[PDB]
């Protein structure tokens, strides 16, 4: 199976360094030129760097010139990317792509991609989330309630209801980045209003990067 | 100041060999493919050879293929052209030109040229010129000097040791069927001053260390 | 092998005129065409690349049009620095050039002043003999010089040479040199060059009898 | 730098429809254009290379045309697997991409169910206060949620969040979160979100008086 596997990404503060590794298999990595392509959260595709099959030629995007360095080890079938003096705008998912093989003298499209590796650069320090209840009051026969997972860093968190017993009708919204540098999402669920008193509802927030586990009861 | 400087041209005999060199400066010579273009005396432009930016590919015109060899030294910023088994029809001025840079699949026009270097192929040996007077015969009269049978080019002609310039016409040399050059230099002067003023032309042929001053007076 | 054909070969124009030069290819070359300018003694200079694009640093009055086989270099308003020779070039199948179009300065008609020069006595002492006939300060360049030795029209023994347009009055000057052997020169009597030019009512003949 | 511009950015379609995506270049890129398919969380998939060539293993319903500056990705008959985002890419002068076209699943109009949540008493003890207003299960996505604090239109303090289209019923859900300070929250009385949507006869307002 022909595949590419990126690795080495993580969460760092500005100025710090990271090194990405992309392990090739299933083809002759020593014969293909490689690219690095990054994709900021919720944005398009941006090109980063290219290296020849023998590493003899390299080209970089103007937004990373001098800070990034591409390299390859044809004896380990591995592409590298040294990311020095990281900035907030460098936050993205970084893909390694393979140049398609053609018999002509010109380069081709990127015919194989990896699953990517997430690089997050933010001055915000690690912080666990606070959980506030969204209480239902007084609409037709079914009412809505939820949990506010405010102020955490970094991503992600996982939210379940009634310890996984409740799944139908649950909507866990994608997190949004507040102007403070911290993330915040909401998780809601529609339930029959008749069971508002009988059944008790508890949401289960889990932030593994900070070892935070919270169970919040949501009652009127 | 991006410039190209050809050098190494001169006078050679048929069958002999010569080497032309073209020195680049002001740009990155190792990133450009180069051409050799020659221009025969009084004729159009003719393409000779092309070399790639890394010297990996070479192509020659059918009129020099097998005889000429193009080469380059990217560490001294110098293009070369080895001319073996030279012929009379190879007599021309030789330019080196730079292919305009594009990221496309095809090459572009020649955006930088050198000053050229003159290559003359003739079996004729060096010979100094004879100077014969063109005497005026019965308001303005004409006289001159015939600079016949010399090799190689060029010669310089002045009148009255540089004192006379107005009305002077020094014609371009013509190549006689003997392989020797020959030109004329004429000047129109007031016929009233034919007796008062004496007229002397100054022929100078540096390639043979020949200096001749001929007095031009009306014959009786 | 692609051949490029320019028209015209010579072109007279004054400062301020609109000048159009055409260049035809023996087969389609898409837009892989360039235009160069060359002055006498100097190097060629890139003007237009890829049929229509203007080279950086080249004045905007230079435009290029065309695609396929018919192309056009246009100088919207001629300038004193533009009098030179212009070459077109295809770079689609190897590299070939046109023969060139020379843009000449136009002026009023001026008839030539004709002068004939007998061979010197010194040159006769050597064994050869050359007869020079001069055309001085004329326009246009087109002139016809024929040699007549004893009223026998000579052909094959003459060589002409022409000056560039004068920097002052923009005129030409030509020198035709008839070369004979002393053997054949000593036996004949009358030598003449007959000059035909636009400024002359009828052809002008300058001659001499040998030994006068 | 060559810039690629795709049109449109969003496109709703049902299974079996013909989908056409256009991609325009700031200058000629010959035929050096590629098309990619990307689904949420996954990597891009090469679909078309050199404008028209189909990558092996891609269904024939994906076709590509174009040359120079205007290109077109056409899905002759849409399939449930084809709902994703599509990017065009030039590889003629370095490598740039289009902003992308998202192909969304079309369904019948469904009005949103609105719910407003006052800030919890626990959050007010911390110093901040967040008012959440929820839009549940609606289509299309285009909705306008405006906050009016004491009938004063607020702007700049709210943030919206939208779910991906539901795998079952292909509907959306939105959450607008107004975030204020405890000082600013305690000064006003009535808080409301005003929802404008295609499925609603007139705009819908859900509100509460602070302290119930």
């Amino acid at each position: 199976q022909v595949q590419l596997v990126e690795s080495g990404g993580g969460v760092v503060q500005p100025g710090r360094s990271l090194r990405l590794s992309c392990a090739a298999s299933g083809f002759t990595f020593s014969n293909y030129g490689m690219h690095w392509v990054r994709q900021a959260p919720g944005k398009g595709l941006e090109w980063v760097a290219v290296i020849w099959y023998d590493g003899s030629k390299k080209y970089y995007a103007d937004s990373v010139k001098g800070r990034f360095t591409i390299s390859r080890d044809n004896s380990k079938n591995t592409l590298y990317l040294q990311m020095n003096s990281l900035r907030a705008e460098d936050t993205a998912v970084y893909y390694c792509a393979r140049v398609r093989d053609s018999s002509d003298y010109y380069g081709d499209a990127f015919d194989i991609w990896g699953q990517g590796t997430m690089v997050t650069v933010s001055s915000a320090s690690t912080k666990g989330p606070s959980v506030f209840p969204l209480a239902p009051s007084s609409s037709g026969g079914t009412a809505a309630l939820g949990c506010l997972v405010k102020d955490y860093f970094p991503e992600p968190v996982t939210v379940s209801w009634n310890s996984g017993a409740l799944t139908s009708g649950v909507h866990t919204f994608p997190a949004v980045l507040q102007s403070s540098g911290l993330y915040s999402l909401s998780s809601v669920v529609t339930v029959p209003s008749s069971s508002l008193g009988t059944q008790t509802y508890i949401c289960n927030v889990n932030h593994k990067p900070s070892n935070t586990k919270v169970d919040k009861r949501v009652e009127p | 100041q991006v410039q190209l400087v050809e050098s190494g041209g001169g006078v050679v005999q048929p069958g002999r060999s010569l080497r032309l060199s073209c020195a680049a400066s002001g740009f990155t010579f190792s990133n450009y493919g180069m051409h050799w273009v020659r221009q025969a005396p009084g004729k159009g432009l003719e393409w000779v050879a092309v070399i790639w930016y890394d010297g990996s590919k070479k192509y020659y015109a059918d009129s020099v293929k097998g005889r000429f060899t193009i080469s380059r030294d990217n560490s001294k910023n110098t293009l070369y052209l080895q001319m073996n088994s030279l012929r009379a029809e190879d007599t021309a001025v030789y330019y080196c030109a730079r292919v305009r840079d594009s990221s496309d699949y095809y090459g572009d026009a020649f955006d930088i040229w050198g000053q050229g270097t003159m290559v003359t192929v003739s079996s004729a040996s060096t010979k100094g010129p004879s100077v014969f007077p063109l005497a005026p015969s019965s308001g303005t009269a004409a006289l001159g000097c015939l600079v016949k049978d010399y090799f190689p080019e060029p010669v310089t002609v002045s009148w009255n040791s540089g004192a006379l310039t107005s009305g002077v016409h020094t014609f371009p040399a013509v190549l006689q069927s003997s392989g020797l050059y020959s030109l004329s230099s004429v000047v129109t002067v007031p016929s009233s001053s034919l007796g008062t003023q004496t007229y002397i032309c100054n022929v100078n042929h540096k390639p043979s260390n020949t200096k001749v001053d001929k007095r031009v007076e009306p014959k009786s | 092998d692609i051949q490029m054909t320019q028209s015209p070969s010579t072109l007279s124009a004054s400062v301020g005129d609109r000048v159009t030069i055409t260049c035809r290819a023996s087969q389609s070359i898409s837009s892989w065409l360039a235009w160069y300018q060359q002055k006498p003694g100097k190097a060629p200079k890139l003007l237009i690349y890829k049929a229509s694009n203007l080279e950086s640093g080249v004045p905007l009055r230079f435009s290029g049009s065309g695609s396929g086989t018919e192309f056009t270099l246009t100088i919207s308003s001629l300038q004193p620095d533009d009098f030179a020779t212009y070459y077109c070039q295809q770079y689609n199948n190897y590299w070939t050039f046109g023969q060139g179009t020379k843009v000449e300065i136009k002026r009023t008609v001026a008839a030539p002043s004709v002068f004939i020069f007998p061979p010197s006595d010194e040159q006769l002492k050597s064994g050869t003999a050359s007869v020079v006939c001069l055309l001085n300060n004329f326009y246009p360049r087109e002139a016809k010089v024929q040699w007549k030795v004893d009223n026998a029209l000579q052909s094959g023994n003459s060589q002409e040479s022409v000056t560039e347009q004068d920097s002052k009055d923009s005129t030409y000057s030509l020198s035709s040199t008839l070369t004979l052997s002393k053997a054949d020169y000593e036996k004949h009597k009358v030598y003449a060059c007959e000059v035909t030019h636009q400024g002359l009512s009828s052809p002008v003949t300058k001659s001499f009898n040998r030994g006068e | 730098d060559i810039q690629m511009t795709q049109s449109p950015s969003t496109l709703s379609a049902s299974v079996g429809d013909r989908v056409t995506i256009t991609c325009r270049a700031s200058q000629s890129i010959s035929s050096w254009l590629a098309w990619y398919q990307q689904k949420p969380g996954k990597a891009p998939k090469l679909l078309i290379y050199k404008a028209s060539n189909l990558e092996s293993g891609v269904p024939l319903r994906f076709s590509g045309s174009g040359s120079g500056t205007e290109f077109t990705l056409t899905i002759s008959s849409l399939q449930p697997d084809d709902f994703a985002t599509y990017y065009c890419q030039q590889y003629n002068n370095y490598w740039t991409f289009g902003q992308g076209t998202k192909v969304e699943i079309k369904r019948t109009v469904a009005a949103p169910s609105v719910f407003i949540f006052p800030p919890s008493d626990e959050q007010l003890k911390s110093g901040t206060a967040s008012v959440v207003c929820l839009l549940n299960n609606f289509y299309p996505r285009e909705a306008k949620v405006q906050w009016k604090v004491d009938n004063a239109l607020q702007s700049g303090n709210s943030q919206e969040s939208v779910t991906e289209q539901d795998s079952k019923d292909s509907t959306y859900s939105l959450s607008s979160t107004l975030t204020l300070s405890k000082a600013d929250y305690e000064k006003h009385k009535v808080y409301a979100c005003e929802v404008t949507h295609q499925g609603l006869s007139s705009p819908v307002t859900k509100s509460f008086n602070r302290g119930e």
């Binding site: 030129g33 290219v50 030629k57 | - | - | -």
Partner: peptide
């Protein structure tokens, strides 16, 4: 095997091992 191909250094040339 085309002599009119780009003779210059090219970032968009074939970065593979095509012999």
């Amino acid at each position: 095997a085309n002599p009119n191909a780009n003779p210059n250094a090219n970032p968009n040339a074939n970065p593979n091992a095509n012999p």
